[PDB]
């Protein structure tokens, strides 16, 4: 059964700018 | 307008070429009609 088991497993830009401004 | 301020003539010359070449076509047809 484990031999079956292994086979089974085998088969916003502005918001960025706004956030970036808060950093500095 | 043709600008001659702060430009060498090769710049000044060609800007005459563009206007003169374009006006040549309209100038030719006008001559034919007036003849």
């Amino acid at each position: 059964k484990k031999q079956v088991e292994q086979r089974l497993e085998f088969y916003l830009a502005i918001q960025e700018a706004m956030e970036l401004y808060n950093k500095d | 307008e043709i600008t001659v301020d702060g430009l060498d003539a090769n710049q000044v010359w060609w800007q005459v070429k563009l206007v003169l070449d374009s006006i040549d076509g309209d100038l030719i047809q006008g001559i034919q009609e007036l003849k």
Partner: protein, 139 residues
């Protein structure tokens, strides 16, 4: 540090419009000379025109989706103003024509289900003859 990002981005964007292929911003000397010379030919062979086409198409798809979103949203909005105008009797000339077209549109559709006249002329003949016997009623 915002200035750094903004400065890069404006430069980053402008690079693409004029120089698509070129990468973006983020030993023996004889080796260096040859590598540059080898670089000259390969970049000359770069299919920059294909690169421009891909960027254009990607942007074209994005704008097209939004234009459809605006179009669909407005058409929905255009309907309610008719509904409220119709309920309040605030119909202008335009609304009274679009609904009149709808009156036409639906009415033409139901005709197809209603079937043609010539079959009715014969079907009614068959109809009446069935009825008289089953109802009988002569007595």
């Amino acid at each position: 540090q915002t200035s750094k990002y903004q400065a890069t981005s404006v430069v980053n964007g402008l690079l693409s419009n004029l120089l698509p292929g070129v990468p973006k911003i983020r030993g023996s000397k004889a080796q260096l000379i040859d590598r540059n010379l080898k670089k000259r030919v390969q970049l000359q062979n770069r299919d920059v025109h294909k690169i421009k086409k891909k960027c254009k198409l990607v942007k074209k798809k994005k704008v097209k989706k939004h234009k459809l979103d605006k179009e669909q949203l407005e058409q929905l909005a255009k309907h309610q103003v008719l509904k409220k105008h119709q309920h309040e009797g605030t119909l202008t000339d335009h609304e009274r024509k679009y609904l009149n077209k709808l009156i036409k549109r639906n009415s033409q559709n139901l005709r197809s289900w209603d079937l043609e006249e010539e079959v009715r002329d014969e079907l009614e003949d068959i109809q009446q003859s069935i009825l008289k016997d089953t109802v009988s009623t002569a007595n």
